[PDB]
Amino acid sequence: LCSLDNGDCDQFCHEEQNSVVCSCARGYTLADNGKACIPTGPYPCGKQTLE
Amino acid sequence: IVGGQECKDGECPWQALLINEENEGFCGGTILSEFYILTAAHCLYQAKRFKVRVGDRNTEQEEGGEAVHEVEVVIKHNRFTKETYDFDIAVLRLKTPITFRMNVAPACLPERDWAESTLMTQKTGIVSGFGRTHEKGRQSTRLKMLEVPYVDRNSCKLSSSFIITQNMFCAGYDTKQEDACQGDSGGPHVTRFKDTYFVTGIVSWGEGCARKGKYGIYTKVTAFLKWIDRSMKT
Ligand SMILES: N=C(N)c1cccc(C[C@@H](NC(=O)N[C@]23C[C@H]4C[C@H](C[C@H](C4)C2)C3)C(=O)NCCc2ccccc2)c1
Ligand SMILES: [Ca+2]
Ligand SMILES: [Ca+2]
């Protein structure tokens, strides 16, 4: 599960009632596929700037 | 940073520099949000009055992207011990919010369990700062970064002359001449994960710099995530 390539999560990976559950840091919203983390603004945390 | 690499444009956005009354950098910090800065508690004894500069890569001259912020509140861990440097952590609340832009952006705060099993388990992390380029030399005028391997926990205790508490972790090399140094203290130790950088450590201390048989010691951010959270709420 989360032990397998981070459960295919972009960021945080949890196992609720078994099975992968992905989450994201503040400033990101979980994508519809529930794995990807989508930046909410021009400068999401953890991203080098290429402004 | 001894023998690292110069932070190229937009590469070390989360870096913050604590400057004294003479506008000289004496410690680093990590940008956590527009209002909060993470640094080492021991750095608070390095200067009486200090401010925080962000967006700077070369201190020799202002380019136009750097910005200075005054500190409104300083939140030092009450258990910080000047003796061993245990609980070496502090959070700074700024009077005016940081404006994110080129070279200015926060690092991500990870969750505890995930960070420990997925981040600390990584092969390496990245440390950066304006500190000394050599043990005896002067503070670097350019911002530098260094990829430092995570060091086996027990393999570290063996090499240390001082006790490595659970609020500490080690990164660096045994002989190779690369390591953080004086002046990088309080600075960012971030771990990359799928092109996203998470704060994992704070430059704390070390016996000298880049010494053979010695590693750099960092305060374990995962052991203070709740503490950090509470601090960012007050
Ligand atoms: N190698 C690193 N990664 C690193 C990173 C940040 C800072 C340091 C060194 C810095 N570290 C410490 O002081 N560590 C302690 C650990 C413990 C408790 C305190 C007293 C003793 C015993 C020494 C502080 C230092 O030794 N001296 C301050 C001035 C100095 C700078 C450069 C060379 C010699 C002396 C090293
Ligand atoms: Ca400058
Ligand atoms: Ca060494």
Q: How far is A17 from chain B (nearest CA, A)?
A: 17
Residues of B in contact with A44 (CB under 8 A): 105
* Nearest residue to B132 via CA among B124, B144, B119: B144
Closest listed residue to residue A45, CA positions, set B13, B150, B120: B13
CB contact under 8 Å between B10 and A11, yes or no, is no
Which tokens hold the place of A45? 């945390």
The distance from CA A5 to its chain's CA centroid, rounded to whole angstroms, is: 13
Quick one: which of B8, B38, B28 has its CA closest to B228?
Answer: B38
User: In the CATH hierarchy, which fold is given to the domain comprising A1-51?
Assistant: Laminin (2.10.25)
Yes or no: say if B114 and B183 are a contact pair by the CB < 8 Å rule. Answer: no
H or E element, residue A23: strand A20-23
- Reading phi first (left if > 0) and then psi (alpha if -120 to 50, else beta), residue B76 is in beta
- A50 shares contact with chain B (CB less than 8 Å): yes
Helix (H, G, I), strand (E, B) or coil at B94: strand
Could you tell me if B66 and B51 are in contact, meaning their C-beta atoms sit under 8 angstroms apart? no
Chosen for mutation from B104, B108, B193 (greatest number of chain A CBs closer than 10 Å) is B108
Q: What does the block give as tokens for B51?
A: 């401010």
Residue burial A23-34, b: 16+ Cβ < 10 Å; e: rest:
bbbebbebeeee
Half-sphere exposure of B164 (CA within 13 A, CB side): 23
Going A7 to A28 to A41 to B92, the CA torsion angle's sign is negative
Distances (CA, A) of B40 to A12, B3, B106, B121, B183: 26, 22, 17, 23, 11
Contact B80, B159 (CB under 8 A): no
Give SS3 for B69. Answer: strand
Number of helical H runs and strand E runs in chain A: 0, 4
Per the CB < 8 A criterion, the answer to whether B28 and B186 are in contact is yes
Distance between CA atoms of residues B214 and B211, nearest Å: 5
Q: Is B206 in the pocket of ligand 1 (CB under 6 A)?
A: yes
**DSSP symbol at B174:** S
Joined tokens for residue B112: 């505890």
Strands (E), chain B: 5-6, 15-19, 25-31, 36-39, 51-54, 67-69, 71-76, 90-94, 124-129, 144-149, 168-171, 188-193, 196-205, 216-220
Q: What distance in Å separates residue B203's CA from the closest CA in chain A?
A: 18
CA distance B224 to chain A (A): 17
Q: Does B218 touch chain A (CB under 8 A)?
A: no
Q: Give the residue from A14, A28, A38, A10 showing the smallest Cα distance to B106.
A: A28
- Ligand 3 centroid – CA B14 distance (Å): 26
Q: What is the resolution of this structure in A?
A: 2.2
Domains, chain B, in order of start with CATH, read 1-12+107-222 (2.40.10.10), 13-106+223-234 (2.40.10.10)
Q: Which entry of B69, B77, B86, B88 is annotated as an active-site residue? A: B88
Ligand closest to the CA atom of residue B160: 1
Cα(A48)–Cα(A29) distance, rounded to whole angstroms? 18
Measured in Å, residue B219 CA sits from the centre of ligand 1 at 14
Q: Which two tokens stand for residue B122?
A: 């990584």
Rounded-to-integer distance, Cα B107 and Cα B188, Å: 9
Residues B129 and B14: beta-carbon distance below 8 Å = no
CA–CA gap between residue B32 and residue B91 (Å, rounded): 9
CB-defined contacts A:B, below 8 A: 69
The burial class, CB within 10 Å (0-12 / 13-18 / 19+), for B30 is: buried
Task: Using an 8 Å CB-CB cutoff, list chain B residues near A14.
Answer: 114
Residue A8 contacts B, CB cutoff 8 Å: no
Distance between start and end Cα atoms, chain B = 33
Contact B198 A13 (CB under 8 A): no
Domain boundaries, chain A: 1-51
Query: CA-CA distance, A15 to B86, in Å (whole number)?
Result: 33
Experimental determination approach used: X-ray
The answer to whether the beta carbons of residues B39 and B92 sit under 8 Å apart is: yes
Burial class (CB in 10 A: 0-12, 13-18, 19+), B5: middle
Residue B65, strand partner residues:
none
Please enumerate in sequence order all residues whose Cβ is within 8 A of that of B161, keeping only pairs 6 or more positions apart, or say none.
B207
Contacts of A39 in chain B (CB under 8 A): none
